[PDB]
């Protein structure tokens, strides 16, 4: 199960400052909630080689650490020790509702960024809730008040494809192969393609980009704590975004 690959001690060393008083989400993200969330998704952190299993929870934690980071260049223990400092978007004005017959907005609810992957919009809360068995359309706020559904939404994102993009799971675990178009676009297996899946339209294909470098910094630090090599193709600086 995932606690066979990452211990409570490793998880706290990775998310070193999440419980400092300056972080909004102080005391929300617990190892226990992470473990409870992971066993709703067989396959997460238990597919492939033991090395790939370790690269998966490191990559998952790296990417969600960048979406919730509270670091700054001179932060204590470096900017890559400050992931998971936030649980919700906060500066948002919008309610992130796009009227939909498929995933209808609940009156008065707002679908701003919540949890580890900062899940946004009614058309993302809907399928996520359907998959984990809770009506997230009616109560999106559960993603910022219940830490295991918070983690489940993030793992759901990780495990689900969004065609033409593969799931992040499939590429880190070796269950995705680039088509001709992906290869022609420089999209080949590695951490870089996961960044491309998550935010490639903004971040990938235009040389060194600081947000991509932030993602990679957390990945490397988590890989070192887990004692696994990083694999190759860590950036997406010359990959075309998925289209």
UniProtKB/Swiss-Prot annotation:
One of its GO terms (molecular function) is endochitinase activity. Its EC number is 3.2.1.14. Keywords: Carbohydrate metabolism, Chitin degradation, Disulfide bond, Glycosidase, Hydrolase, Plant defense, Polysaccharide degradation, Signal. It catalyses: Random endo-hydrolysis of N-acetyl-beta-D-glucosaminide (1->4)-beta-linkages in chitin and chitodextrins. Belongs to the glycosyl hydrolase 19 family. Chitinase class II subfamily. It comes from the Eukaryota. Pfam families: Glyco_hydro_19. Disulfide bonds join 23-85, 97-105, 204-236. It comes from Hordeum vulgare (Barley). Defense against chitin-containing fungal pathogens. This is 26 kDa endochitinase 2. PANTHER family: CHITINASE (PTHR22595:SF127), CHITINASE-RELATED (PTHR22595). InterPro entries: Glyco_hydro_19, Glyco_hydro_19_cat, Lysozyme-like_dom_sf. The active site is at residue 67. One of its GO terms (biological process) is defense response to fungus.
